[PDB]
Amino acid sequence: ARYLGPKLKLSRREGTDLFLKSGVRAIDTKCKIEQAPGQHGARKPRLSDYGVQLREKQKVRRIYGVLERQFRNYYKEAARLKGNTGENLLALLEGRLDNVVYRMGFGATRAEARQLVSHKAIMVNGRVVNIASYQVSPNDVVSIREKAKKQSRVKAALELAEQREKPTWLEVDAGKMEGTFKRKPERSDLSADINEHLIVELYSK
Amino acid sequence: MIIATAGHVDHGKTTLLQAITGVNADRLPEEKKRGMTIDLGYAYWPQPDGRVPGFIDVPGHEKFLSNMLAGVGGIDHALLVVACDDGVMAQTREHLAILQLTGNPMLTVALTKADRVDEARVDEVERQVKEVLREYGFAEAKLFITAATEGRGMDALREHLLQLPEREHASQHSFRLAIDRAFTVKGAGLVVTGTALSGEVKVGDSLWLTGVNKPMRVRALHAQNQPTETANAGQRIALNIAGDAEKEQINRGDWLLADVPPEPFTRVIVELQTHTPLTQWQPLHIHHAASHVTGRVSLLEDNLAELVFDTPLWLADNDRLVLRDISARNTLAGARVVMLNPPRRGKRKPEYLQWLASLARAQSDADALSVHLERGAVNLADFAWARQLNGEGMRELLQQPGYIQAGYSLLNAPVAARWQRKILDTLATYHEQHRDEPGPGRERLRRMALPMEDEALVLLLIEKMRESGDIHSHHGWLHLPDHKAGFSEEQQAIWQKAEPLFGDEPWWVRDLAKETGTDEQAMRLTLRQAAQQGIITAIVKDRYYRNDRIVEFANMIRDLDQECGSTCAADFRDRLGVGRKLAIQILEYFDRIGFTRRRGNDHLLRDALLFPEK
Amino acid sequence: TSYIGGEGHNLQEHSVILIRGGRVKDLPGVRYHTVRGALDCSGVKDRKQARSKYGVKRPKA
RNA sequence: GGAAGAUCGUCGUCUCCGGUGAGGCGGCUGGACUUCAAAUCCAGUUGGGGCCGCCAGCGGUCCCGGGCAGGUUCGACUCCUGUGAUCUUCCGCCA
RNA sequence: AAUUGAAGAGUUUGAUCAUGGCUCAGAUUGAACGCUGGCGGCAGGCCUAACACAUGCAAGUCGAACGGUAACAGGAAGAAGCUUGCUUCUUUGCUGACGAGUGGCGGACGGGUGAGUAAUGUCUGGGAAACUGCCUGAUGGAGGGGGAUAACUACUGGAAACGGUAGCUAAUACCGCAUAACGUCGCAAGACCAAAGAGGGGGACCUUCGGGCCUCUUGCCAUCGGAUGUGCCCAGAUGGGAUUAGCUAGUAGGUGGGGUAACGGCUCACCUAGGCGACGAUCCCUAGCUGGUCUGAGAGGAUGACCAGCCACACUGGAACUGAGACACGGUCCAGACUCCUACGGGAGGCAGCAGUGGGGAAUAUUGCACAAUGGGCGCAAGCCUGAUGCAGCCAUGCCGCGUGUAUGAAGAAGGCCUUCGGGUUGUAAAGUACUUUCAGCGGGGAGGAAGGGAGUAAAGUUAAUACCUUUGCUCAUUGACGUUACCCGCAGAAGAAGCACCGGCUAACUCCGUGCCAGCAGCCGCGGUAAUACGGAGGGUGCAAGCGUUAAUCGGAAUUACUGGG
Ligand SMILES: Nc1nc2c(ncn2[C@@H]2O[C@H](COP(=O)(O)OP(=O)(O)NP(=O)(O)O)[C@@H](O)[C@H]2O)c(=O)[nH]1
Numbered sequence A: 001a002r003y004l005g006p007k008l009k010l011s012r013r014e015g016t017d018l019f020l021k022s023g024v025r026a027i028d029t030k031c032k033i034e035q036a037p038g039q040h041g042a043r044k045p046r047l048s049d050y051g052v053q054l055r056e057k058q059k060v061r062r063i064y065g066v067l068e069r070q071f072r073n074y075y076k077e078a079a080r081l082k083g084n085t086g087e088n089l090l091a092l093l094e095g096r097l098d099n100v101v102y103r104m105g106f107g108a109t110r111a112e113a114r115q116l117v118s119h120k121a122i123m124v125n126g127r128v129v130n131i132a133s134y135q136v137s138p139n140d141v142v143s144i145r146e147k148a149k150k151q152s153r154v155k156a157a158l159e160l161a162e163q164r165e166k167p168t169w170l171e172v173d174a175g176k177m178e179g180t181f182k183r184k185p186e187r188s189d190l191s192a193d194i195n196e197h198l199i200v201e202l203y204s205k
Numbered sequence B: 001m002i003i004a005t006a007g008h009v010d011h012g013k014t015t016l017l018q019a020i021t022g023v024n025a026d027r028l029p030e031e032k033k034r035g036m037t038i039d040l041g042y043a044y045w046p047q048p049d050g051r052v053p054g055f056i057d058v059p060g061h062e063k064f065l066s067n068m069l070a071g072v073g074g075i076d077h078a079l080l081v082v083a084c085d086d087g088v089m090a091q092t093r094e095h096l097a098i099l100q101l102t103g104n105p106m107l108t109v110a111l112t113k114a115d116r117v118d119e120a121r122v123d124e125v126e127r128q129v130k131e132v133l134r135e136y137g138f139a140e141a142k143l144f145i146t147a148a149t150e151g152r153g154m155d156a157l158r159e160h161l162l163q164l165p166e167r168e169h170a171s172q173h174s175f176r177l178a179i180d181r182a183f184t185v186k187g188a189g190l191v192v193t194g195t196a197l198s199g200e201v202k203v204g205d206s207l208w209l210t211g212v213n214k215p216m217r218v219r220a221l222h223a224q225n226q227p228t229e230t231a232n233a234g235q236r237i238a239l240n241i242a243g244d245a246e247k248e249q250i251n252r253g254d255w256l257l258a259d260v261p262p263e264p265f266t267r268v269i270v271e272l273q274t275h276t277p278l279t280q281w282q283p284l285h286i287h288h289a290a291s292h293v294t295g296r297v298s299l300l301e302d303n304l305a306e307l308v309f310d311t312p313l314w315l316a317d318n319d320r321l322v323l324r325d326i327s328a329r330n331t332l333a334g335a336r337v338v339m340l341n342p343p344r345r346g347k348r349k350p351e352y353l354q355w356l357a358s359l360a361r362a363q364s365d366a367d368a369l370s371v372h373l374e375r376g377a378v379n380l381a382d383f384a385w386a387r388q389l390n391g392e393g394m395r396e397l398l399q400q401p402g403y404i405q406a407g408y409s410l411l412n413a414p415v416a417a418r419w420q421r422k423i424l425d426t427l428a429t430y431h432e433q434h435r436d437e438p439g440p441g442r443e444r445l446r447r448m449a450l451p452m453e454d455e456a457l458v459l460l461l462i463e464k465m466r467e468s469g470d471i472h473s474h475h476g477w478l479h480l481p482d483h484k485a486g487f488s489e490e491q492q493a494i495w496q497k498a499e500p501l502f503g504d505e506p507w508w509v510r511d512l513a514k515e516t517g518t519d520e521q522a523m524r525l526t527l528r529q530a531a532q533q534g535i536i537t538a539i540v541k542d543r544y545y546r547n548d549r550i551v552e553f554a555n556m557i558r559d560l561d562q563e564c565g566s567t568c569a570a571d572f573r574d575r576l577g578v579g580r581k582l583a584i585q586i587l588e589y590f591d592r593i594g595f596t597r598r599r600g601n602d603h604l605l606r607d608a609l610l611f612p613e614k
Numbered sequence C: 001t002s003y004i005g006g007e008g009h010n011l012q013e014h015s016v017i018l019i020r021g022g023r024v025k026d027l028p029g030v031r032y033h034t035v036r037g038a039l040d041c042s043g044v045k046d047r048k049q050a051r052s053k054y055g056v057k058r059p060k061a
Numbered sequence D: 001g002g003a004a005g006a007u008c009g010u011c012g013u014c015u016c017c018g019g020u021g022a023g024g025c026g027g028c029u030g031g032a033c034u035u036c037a038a039a040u041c042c043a044g045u046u047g048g049g050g051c052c053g054c055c056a057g058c059g060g061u062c063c064c065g066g067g068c069a070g071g072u073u074c075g076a077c078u079c080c081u082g083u084g085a086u087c088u089u090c091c092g093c094c095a
Numbered sequence E: 001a002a003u004u005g006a007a008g009a010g011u012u013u014g015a016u017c018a019u020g021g022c023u024c025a026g027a028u029u030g031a032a033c034g035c036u037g038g039c040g041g042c043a044g045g046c047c048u049a050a051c052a053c054a055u056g057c058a059a060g061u062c063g064a065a066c067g068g069u070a071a072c073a074g075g076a077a078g079a080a081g082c083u084u085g086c087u088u089c090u091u092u093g094c095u096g097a098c099g100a101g102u103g104g105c106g107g108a109c110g111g112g113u114g115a116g117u118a119a120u121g122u123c124u125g126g127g128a129a130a131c132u133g134c135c136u137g138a139u140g141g142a143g144g145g146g147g148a149u150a151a152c153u154a155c156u157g158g159a160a161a162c163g164g165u166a167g168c169u170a171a172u173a174c175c176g177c178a179u180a181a182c183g184u185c186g187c188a189a190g191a192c193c194a195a196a197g198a199g200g201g202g203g204a205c206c207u208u209c210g211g212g213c214c215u216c217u218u219g220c221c222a223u224c225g226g227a228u229g230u231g232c233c234c235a236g237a238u239g240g241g242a243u244u245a246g247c248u249a250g251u252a253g254g255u256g257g258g259g260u261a262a263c264g265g266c267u268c269a270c271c272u273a274g275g276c277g278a279c280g281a282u283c284c285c286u287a288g289c290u291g292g293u294c295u296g297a298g299a300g301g302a303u304g305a306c307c308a309g310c311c312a313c314a315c316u317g318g319a320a321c322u323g324a325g326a327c328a329c330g331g332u333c334c335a336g337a338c339u340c341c342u343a344c345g346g347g348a349g350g351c352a353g354c355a356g357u358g359g360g361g362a363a364u365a366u367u368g369c370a371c372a373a374u375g376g377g378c379g380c381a382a383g384c385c386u387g388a389u390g391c392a393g394c395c396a397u398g399c400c401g402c403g404u405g406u407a408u409g410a411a412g413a414a415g416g417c418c419u420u421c422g423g424g425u426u427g428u429a430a431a432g433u434a435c436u437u438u439c440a441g442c443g444g445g446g447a448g449g450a451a452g453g454g455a456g457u458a459a460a461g462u463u464a465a466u467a468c469c470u471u472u473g474c475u476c477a478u479u480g481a482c483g484u485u486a487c488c489c490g491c492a493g494a495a496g497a498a499g500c501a502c503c504g505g506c507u508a509a510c511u512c513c514g515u516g517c518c519a520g521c522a523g524c525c526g527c528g529g530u531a532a533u534a535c536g537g538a539g540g541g542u543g544c545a546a547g548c549g550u551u552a553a554u555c556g557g558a559a560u561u562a563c564u565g566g567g
């Protein structure tokens, strides 16, 4: 299932800041991201159309840490859903619990989010959930279990959360480190880097 | 009580059995047709006492000798019928030699055809048998004179067979089964029948069939013509098993056994005892339980011989097998499987002494465990295979104190200590060899010490020394506790002239090298060591400064949170005159340190001492 | 008539093998391949990558 | 499993062959020749083991070899006696 | 709100544009094979030989129909031991019950398989000339007699299988008789048709003291209704072949008889000469049909595995009986092939039920647990039965979810590879430090699937009746195969867990070594002839992930059968 390997070679295949490992920093930049994607990484390669849209699709699916078959599930439902397929695709993909745990801010990385949610710590509506794929319903509060509280990791991540500047579609108190989800975002309020229609025609073959 | 009948042809082997057990051994049509025993037949004798003896009737013909060697496996007692016709014949001798090499504990001689010859011949043959038995190492033997036609001495013979003891085997053993006849019964399955050499099996067990190499679930089983939920060693076990394989694919000589076995090995060492001298590098027929193979023998030191197989075969330690003349005719020698994986350097002078240690010295697995440890690290896969040890039996090594058990192989406390010493002194050599380095790394240590060994054991052993405190390491660099990362004069001599220079204004590496006429790479590395000492600090790669300007860099950052409340470039020029390039590299130096952190427009102060009291 | 792939093979007189489709496009009239590794056709040894093709078990070390 | 049988040199095959092997055909390597071939002349075409120092796609030694041994004989691929690898045919497997 | 939906690429040539094939990119599958494989959920799992079958189980039930007492538990006269109120023994169907027997109802449902079937089928839509057990509504009856028979007894046949001889007995078994019209026939007059009791309780009263009598429950016969199920007709729709053009004599119509639950050449006698067919008759090849599954923008194309409806078949070929229902999977009879026993006369058997075995095949599972739930048979009920069903086992066969750690970590270590010999890359990757413990492992707690049924009790209803029985409340004790359940709570240690394919273009991803048109690769176009990004190895990357590839199949693309949509 999960990736389990070097993070920032995946981050530097697209030459972007993919946010895969942040912690004390945001981007490492000392790790030579653009200069060495592989042994032949240094020489620039011309990208043909299928390569630009596939390369993009790989990028987003790595930034959110999803595999391809349930990413294709997310797409087939996204298309089946009413409204623009790109916009509501991304939005329903952000409904993933691990993503939300990251956006509320308590967590290091979305892989750490995977860790924390998998380990029984997360609590939704007074119920525990292991599943990182759980799509959080709108206007629903989510908390972390009381005994799971006191873990060193959660606050040391909260500090990071204040630094990153936080999202506007979620309201997080973080006094008890319990925030509330509000509404599913729209394409315009986030990212401005991913180009989603590349994915939608890539699957329109 | 498995009892095998042996003797020369038509000396009443089968007839005796029908007398004792009322079972007609011959079942194959041709033997019915030709009046002989072409292939092995089995007879059983249930008793009201509840214990059933197992009777194996083997042919006597030299042509069918290859069949008899399959049934002589796992005999508890052997009865050699000798007929007073011609008395002891050469083939009787051959059967005796074969039983001797299989190391059967005892035998009962029963003399037939009492009616056909007068009493005189009974005493004469008696004498001749008593003389022949001494040749083959069976001293105590019970001679019975009987004629199966009239059943004259059948009764006297009967009580003795019940009197025979059952030779037991150790409680914990991997089940091992010698397939004999693969035959499909119409009702329910594939039923393969074979002698169980060791262990117990139950209906729920999963087995590994060899040559098909596929696991097979036991559907049902018969202990000895008796349905049962379990089966113990020392009896023929009809075994009805499910799974992918089928009878046509099965070929006599396949093993059923509890766990996947390691790959069959062609070479092997054997204790050698023989009636006639062998000859170096000579072809012969290796007979192993229900297996026919041709391999070439070699002679090492004294009574130690090497078998090389052209057909790979699964063998376990302490397995008696017979080596026969390659063109047949003559049984010449015996064999025992002693080492399962001999390497090269056989006749080198140090090792023969070792072989003596491994074989003559120990009759048990625990002693063997120590012997192998003396030789080196002991792989549990290989040792379990050689000794056929179950989980319970395997855990006993763990119980013995002073055993390093890593991911795989065991190590004795003395040998462990020896390795520890070698590693330490090798460590010391590397320590001495590079005096400018913080120490060697863990993996590099293992490569500089014992590259050929198992990684888990050698590294676990390293951990043992770490915990003892013999090696203290920091930042993952393992150096002796005595090391101070002091350096050598060879560095200081440059650092003396480098000192005033560095002082009044520090400069870049390539410029430094140019100023003192020293090689760039040499100069950069010596100064990096100087920087490990705490004399100069690189704010960026190849750029080195003093300390007194680092604290000054903190003085300029000091006024930013208090006077501005933000961090920006502009104050580089509007505060002291320190350039933008300099200030930015200063900032990235302090960002990596943790004096400041960068997010969007500004630098945070989560963890530093930049802060004044008020 | 079915092609035999890989370098070297143990196949001789009457050997029971099993064949799969695919055509070679050089030897007109062979429309099949024999699989390496099934029934009496042994998986080509001395081969590392692409070994699910050609049916040879992995090296232990 | 039994019985009957076929084949298995020195790169492949056929004809042989009691004087320590011969002959044809093909294949391969090398030469003349070219980008490499084909063709046309030339030259060549023994292997495997044990013991010993690297594993080196090695280096020495000694031996054995018409599947693997033995006997015959002054001398065996050839005569004779066993047996193995693959394999044809018939027979039988019965807890 | 119920739709929102249509992409191209490579290869003919020196180059071009057309025509036209072939190949690819997508989705899918009851798949198989290779390498690899941690867990859980929900599905699925002989596509071949409708080939043969060992062993076990898969249809029984009612003593509230009957005569009875084989087996057990009480009780009884008695035996009368001795422990003198515990125990010993015969006799006793008299009570609870029940083997074997007659009788009722079931076995025509449930389950399997697709051989046959081109229409005797199936689907859609109509119809008249029908029958329908148990279910339900109404109207009424339910009176009065007899002769047997199985079981049983005595004998006897036969190895077995199953009978035979003689005698006895009961029934809600069977046959009379009486009765009966809104039933049958008949224009009518008229004629004719049936039944069976049993059980629980009971005051007075009868009492051959067996029982009669009252009340309730339930059973039986008759006719008409309802539901249901089934039979029959008709029109249309449902493959390919004209390198099958003629076909039909009970087949086309009539009148009369016969037959069926019912219309009908269904059948027979006689008469007439019809009848079907280029809108494809007849013959041949293949085939179970449908709701639907896959695909496609759609129109179409393929298909009919799982689930549900209908049809056909039960070793092969026939025939009929009993029955409301069969021409009957585990019923009868005859024939036939094949297996088995036998005492040689004779019998016996049919997995396309659940398992399972042999064979065939590339290939497809356990000789398991429970009737706890739903449903079915019988029964007043309890219950008993149930391979239906509920579950479990096995298999990565599919779909889905999770894990194989997380954070920090540079003098960018070693080793590997590459180098322009300066270095680059593997690579924050590893090591180190600080954390977690999901799943697995170990130990504790712990739902829901459970409705009812049984005992008791109260009221109402019933009735001569404070009884029986029915209904509805209330109290009690109890019903789980899965099951060591889901789920939760503790323990310890990153500890037990990542492959497979590809890297010339199409198509994401390149360098070195070995070989030298050899060895090999190849979906297509191509590579290799001494500098191979195409072979083999390595290093690096890419794509997928407990899977990855290959092969097989269908649609798509293919406007490449062009109705939409071509020449
Ligand atoms: N007089 C006598 N003859 C005997 C006796 N036992 C066996 N035989 C002989 O042996 C013949 C049967 O052979 P068998 O007893 O089977 O001898 P075997 O050694 O078992 N046959 P094989 O060695 O081939 O297996 C009979 O014909 C009979 O003559 C005995 O006790 N007395």
Ligand SMILES: [Mg+2]
Residues within 6 Å of the ligand: B012, B013, B014, B015, B036, B037
């Ligand atoms: Mg005998």
Ligand SMILES: [Mg+2]
Residues within 6 Å of the ligand: B010, B034, B035, B036
């Ligand atoms: Mg004889």
Ligand SMILES: [Mg+2]
Residues within 6 Å of the ligand: B281, B282, B283, B296
């Ligand atoms: Mg030899």
Ligand SMILES: [Mg+2]
Residues within 6 Å of the ligand: E013
């Ligand atoms: Mg061209």
Ligand SMILES: [Mg+2]
Residues within 6 Å of the ligand: E133
């Ligand atoms: Mg009836």
Ligand SMILES: [Mg+2]
Residues within 6 Å of the ligand: E193
């Ligand atoms: Mg009447």
Ligand SMILES: [Mg+2]
Residues within 6 Å of the ligand: none
């Ligand atoms: Mg029918």
Ligand SMILES: [Mg+2]
Residues within 6 Å of the ligand: E329, E330, E351
């Ligand atoms: Mg049946």
Ligand SMILES: [Mg+2]
Residues within 6 Å of the ligand: E361
């Ligand atoms: Mg087969």
Ligand SMILES: [Mg+2]
Residues within 6 Å of the ligand: none
């Ligand atoms: Mg039963």
Ligand SMILES: [Mg+2]
Residues within 6 Å of the ligand: none
């Ligand atoms: Mg998945």
Ligand SMILES: [Mg+2]
Residues within 6 Å of the ligand: E439, E440
């Ligand atoms: Mg667990």
Ligand SMILES: [Mg+2]
Residues within 6 Å of the ligand: E463
């Ligand atoms: Mg009343």
Ligand SMILES: [Mg+2]
Residues within 6 Å of the ligand: E521
């Ligand atoms: Mg390839």
Ligand SMILES: [Mg+2]
Residues within 6 Å of the ligand: none
């Ligand atoms: Mg089309």
Ligand SMILES: [Mg+2]
Residues within 6 Å of the ligand: E566, E567
């Ligand atoms: Mg056209």
